[PDB]
């Protein structure tokens, strides 16, 4: 596998978004993964609608602004036959009536692939071969809220009890040795002002830190 990967440098990733006061990170994680796969398939980067997922995927088990899961979102896109663009179905950060319009669909998936649970090496293979990967993590810490620089490492982090969905866009390392001081490149949905331009480096190969490889998945397009 490559010593480092950064799908942002290849055009696969949209600018950082902001979920605001709605518990929809699962939807931003899912649109980010679908944006990358649609780019890999067509060469066009098109921002996708989180609101479409918030409003319409209750049957699949999502709860809108009260939480959800990325795999359930990919399930909805498969069952639904499509997903609207951000532009045609704008984000308003509250639960609303489903307004899915097939004529505005710009994405599709046939299901999704699961990374083996807990395997950082398996997550590394998927990031390297596929593109950006949806992942769950434990983000419930002030140290995460005020993250700014460096490789994030929080002793209080759980690898099992997770509460946030994010997007792994690559991986890398500090210094000249590719085998140490490793990190995951993670896209958040708290706006560009949060973190490092909306991104965070999470410690890699430090026993599945914050659960990054516990529940990872990507859409099949
Ligand atoms: Cl999931
Ligand atoms: Cl840094
Ligand atoms: Cl940056």
Numbering used by the authors: 1 to 221
Paper passage:
Addressing the elusive specificity of cysteine cathepsins, which in contrast to caspases and trypsin-like proteases lack strict specificity determining P1 pocket, calls for innovative approaches. Hence, we set out to determine the crystal structures of cathepsin complexes with representative peptides of cleaved substrates. As a working model, cathepsin V was chosen because of the resolution of diffracting crystals (up to 1.3 Å) and crystal packing with accessible active site cleft. Reactive site mutants C25A and C25S of cathepsin V were used in structural studies.
The pattern II group (binding shifted to the non-primed side) consisted of structures of nine protected peptides and one non-protected peptide that all bound uncleaved into the non-primed sites. At P4 and beyond, the features of the electron density maps became weaker and less precise; however, it was possible to model the peptides KPKKKTK, RLSAKP, GNYKEAKK, and EVCKKKK up to P8 in the averaged kick Fo-Fc omit maps. The pattern IV group (binding of cleaved peptide fragments at primed and non-primed side) included structures of two peptides, LLKAVAEKQ and RLSAKP, which were both bound along the active site cleft of cathepsin V. LLKAVAEKQ was designed as a hybrid containing the LLK-fragment from the LLKVAL peptide, which was cleaved and remained bound to cathepsin V on the non-primed side, and AVAEKQ, which bound non-cleaved to the primed side. In the structure of RLSAKP, the fragment RLS bound to the non-primed subsites S3–S1 and the fragment AKP to the primed subsites S1–S3′. The distance of 2.6 Å between C of Ser at P1 and N of Ala at P1′ and the continuous electron density between them resembled the LLKAVAEKQ structure. Overall, their electron densities were weak, and the fragments were refined with partial occupancies. Peptides from patterns I and IV bound to cathepsin V consistent with the observed protein cleavage sites, whereas the peptides from patterns II and III did not bind according to their cleavage site found in proteins.
